[PDB]
Amino acid sequence: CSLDNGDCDQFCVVCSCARGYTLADNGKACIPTGPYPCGKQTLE
Amino acid sequence: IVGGQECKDGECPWQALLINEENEGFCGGTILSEFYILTAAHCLYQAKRFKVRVGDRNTEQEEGGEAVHEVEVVIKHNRFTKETYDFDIAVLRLKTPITFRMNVAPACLPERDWAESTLMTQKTGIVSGFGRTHEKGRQSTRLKMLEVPYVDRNSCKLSSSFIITQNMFCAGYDTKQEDACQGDSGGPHVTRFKDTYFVTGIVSWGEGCARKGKYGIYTKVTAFLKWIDRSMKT
Numbered sequence: 041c042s043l044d045n046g047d048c049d050q051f052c053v054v055c056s057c058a059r060g061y062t063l064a065d066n067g068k069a070c071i072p073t074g075p076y077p078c079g080k081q082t083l084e
Numbered sequence: 085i086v087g088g089q090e091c092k093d094g095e096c097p098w099q100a101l102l103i104n105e106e107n108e109g110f111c112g113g114t115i116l117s118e119f120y121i122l123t124a125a126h127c128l129y130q131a132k133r134f135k136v137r138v139g140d141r142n143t144e145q146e147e148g149g150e151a152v153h154e155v156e157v158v159i160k161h162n163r164f165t166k167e168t169y170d171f172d173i174a175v176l177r178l179k180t181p182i183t184f185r186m187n188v189a190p191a192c193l194p195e196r197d198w199a200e201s202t203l204m205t206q207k208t209g210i211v212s213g214f215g216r217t218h219e220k221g222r223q224s225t226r227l228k229m230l231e232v233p234y235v236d237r238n239s240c241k242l243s244s245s246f247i248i249t250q251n252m253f254c255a256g257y258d259t260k261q262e263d264a265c266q267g268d269s270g271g272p273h274v275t276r277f278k279d280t281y282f283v284t285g286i287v288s289w290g291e292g293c294a295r296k297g298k299y300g301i302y303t304k305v306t307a308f309l310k311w312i313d314r315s316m317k318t
């Protein structure tokens with residue numbers, strides 16, 4: 041977890057994500073489940 | 085906010101504004117979910133009755149996306165006191181759920197150990213709000229944001245007239261004229277990790293605003309992640 045956050049997109053090798061996110065196939069990236077996921081700036 | 089800049093469309097969607105009986109903003113909040121707003125305990129003392137406005141970027145103009153919510157339940161930390169300003173945290177449950185849209189979306193809550201090790205050790209965070217633009221001046225009618233560096237705890241304690249507790253952290257600038265101010269209190273301090281913003285602080289207090297040799301003091305949200313979780317489950 042020390043080096044590059046364990047390559048994790050969010051929480052840390054065992055990665056995980058915040059509510060409203062699913063951990064990706066690669067087991068590192070996080071995929072949002074809804075149009076307005078937490079902690080993302082909104083676009084039109 | 086002293087210094088900083090107006091938030092661009094969608095840039096600060098987790099911002100909430102507590103409005104008093106005179107329909108005037110007096111404190112900020114952070115959207116945590118469709119039902120919960122995070123704010124400072126000390127804000128609750130400033131208005132007998134208040135509502136929450138989301139989606140507003142300019143308090144002088146009604147623009148699309150603004151909505152008003154009544155508060156159903158106020159959950160103030162039982163250890164907050166004005167003597168020390170320690171435990172300066174509250175959660176508001178709203179009567180009706182917020183509809184997420186452009187300019188209206190929650191900030192992420194992090195996990196405690198990860199946040200302590202990875203978020204808080206970042207260089208900077210972002211503070212936002214509609215508070216005073218100068219210490220002795222008027223509140224901003226436009227939503228402003230400001231990047232504020234994390235400041236070393238010991239440096240901050242040396243600078244402060246008051247005790248800095250483990251439930252607080254410091255951020256901002258020694259002498260540069262940029263800081264949060266009164267009226268921003270209760271609002272969000274967020275830290276970006278990669279492309280996600282996580283709530284790391286609640287705008288709490290400071291001696292004046294943007295004073296040379298003083299910093300802004302924030303409630304350290306990591307200290308209260310269990311408390312928040314318990315508050316949001318009732």
Ligand SMILES: CS(=O)(=O)N1C[C@H](C(=O)Nc2ccc(Cl)c(F)c2)[C@@H](C(=O)Nc2ccc(-n3ccccc3=O)cc2F)C1
Nearest residue numbers: 167168169219246264265266287288289290291292300301
């Ligand atoms: C001059 S002003 O414009 O009228 N205004 C600006 C100050 C401010 O809040 N600035 C501010 C600046 C930066 C940030 Cl981040 C932030 F939230 C706020 C506010 C103040 O003096 N606050 C203050 C000062 C001290 C304690 N405190 C702390 C510990 C123990 C006891 C104790 O009373 C509590 C306080 F509310 C007065």
Ligand SMILES: [Ca+2]
Nearest residue numbers: 142145146147
């Ligand atoms: Ca408006």
Ligand code: NA
Nearest residue numbers: 257258295298
């Ligand atoms: Na300062």
